[PDB]
Design a binder for this molecule. Structure first.
Ligand SMILES: [Mn+2]
Ligand SMILES: [Mn+2]
Lengths: 7, 294
């Protein structure tokens, strides 16, 4: 969920 | 290049307090980059390795966790190591992280190995942190030095002809291992192709064959693809990283593939563990895990 480039 | 001095200073903060910086000189960092770059170009792009050894997944600047990993697996040269990439970005200490790894590569070039991850690429660095860390603590020229070094990192490794290791995953363009060997360095990661896929692809339980990757680049592949690959190449396992997995490690396709993520407490959606895989002489696997902060 961090940003899908990727949590 | 005073390697031993650099290593001592890097290790010096062990136990001091999570977050304490180790500020090497730019000349020292430049030296780590130039000497390791030389070694990378000197060794195969497709590494042929021997077990036993320890394999680590993504670190992402979590220096203090890298230190916990070495403490658990044994600081070089107490054990052989193969890191699968993604040393920088996201974390607070990408500089100390990449510097210690480059230092150990130079120190033990035949017993320490580093593969290229999708984050060891200039464009991604600008967005995910490494560029800003370098600009703040050093200068932009040093960041370029790092990228030139990154552009020479090996892309894959095969442990005792049975375990195929890479950062991302398989490629629909991967017919022969010689294709990988043909990849010339220095090189940046392209938007498409074999090299791109090896650093970007992901396995997908829900995919039949090859599929589109939600990352906006590369592909996703199914268990059948894996099974077919191993069979065709007479391999036993595919060891990769790239994806955050809650237990630090996760098997795929009836244990024909394993994902390793070594940076604990990285994910926002969940408290993930960080795992390091020990591969013994008979290619059996066991794990040493950094469980989430209880
Ligand atoms: Mn990655
Ligand atoms: Mn990663």
């Amino acid at each position: 969920x961090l940003x899908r480039x990727x949590x | 290049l005073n390697l031993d001095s650099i290593i001592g200073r890097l290790l010096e903060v062990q136990g001091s307090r999570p977050g304490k910086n180790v500020q090497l000189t730019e000349n020292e960092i430049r030296g780590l980059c130039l000497k390791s770059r030389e070694i990378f170009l000197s060794q195969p792009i497709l590494l042929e390795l021997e077990a036993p050894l320890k394999i680590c997944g993504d670190i992402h600047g979590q220096y203090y966790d890298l230190l916990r990993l070495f403490e658990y697996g044994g600081f070089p040269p107490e054990s052989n190591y193969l890191f699968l990439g993604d040393y920088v970005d996201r974390g607070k200490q990408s500089l100390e992280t990449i510097c210690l790894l480059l230092a150990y590569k130079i120190k033990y070039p035949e017993n320490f190995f580093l593969l290229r991850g999708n984050h060891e690429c200039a464009s991604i660095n600008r967005i995910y942190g490494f560029y800003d860390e370098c600009k703040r603590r050093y200068n932009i020229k040093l960041w370029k030095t790092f990228t030139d070094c990154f552009n020479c990192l090996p892309i894959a490794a095969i442990v005792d002809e049975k375990i195929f290791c890479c950062h991302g995953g398989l490629s629909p363009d991967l017919q022969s291992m010689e294709q990988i060997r043909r990849i010339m360095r220095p090189t940046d990661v392209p938007d498409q192709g074999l090299l791109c896929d090896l650093l970007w692809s992901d396995p997908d339980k829900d995919v039949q064959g090859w599929g589109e990757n939600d990352r906006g680049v590369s592909f996703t592949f199914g268990a059948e693809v894996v099974a077919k690959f191993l069979h065709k190449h007479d391999l036993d396992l595919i060891c990769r990283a790239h994806q955050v997995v809650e237990d630090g490690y996760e098997f795929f396709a009836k244990r024909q593939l394993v994902t390793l993520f070594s940076a604990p407490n990285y994910c926002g959606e969940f408290d993930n563990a960080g795992a390091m895989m020990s591969v013994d002489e008979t290619l059996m696997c066991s794990f040493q895990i950094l469980k989430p902060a209880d």
